[PDB]
Amino acid sequence: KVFGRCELAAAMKRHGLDNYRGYSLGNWVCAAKFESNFNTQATNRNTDGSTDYGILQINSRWWCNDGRTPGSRNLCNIPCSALLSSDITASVNCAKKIVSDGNGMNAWVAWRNRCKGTDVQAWIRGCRL
């Protein structure tokens, strides 16, 4: 599923992401835009053999099992394919675990490079929330 901007904002808010660990909703929408272009089916292979999955591009070396990343930890205890669903629940619950592990949203390279320090509220402006 390719989400609309406000559609995704509302879904993330419903799943408890607004101000989760102090990160306003606009941060999460900005990270999804630049990680996946709002596409739940996005995948990207990395040089170390890991693959990033779904709307928030969660990595198979630490967080989910895709059966082809040796030494995977599978800390969210989910098959990576579950992160590609049209229902973002699995991606949200896993991202809540990621953003709590110490480095905050810096775990998402695109958030660090393209959202951090910007006016992220612009990503939810105009939306009926």
Ligand SMILES: [Cl-]
């Ligand atoms: Cl915001």
Ligand SMILES: [Cl-]
């Ligand atoms: Cl933080």
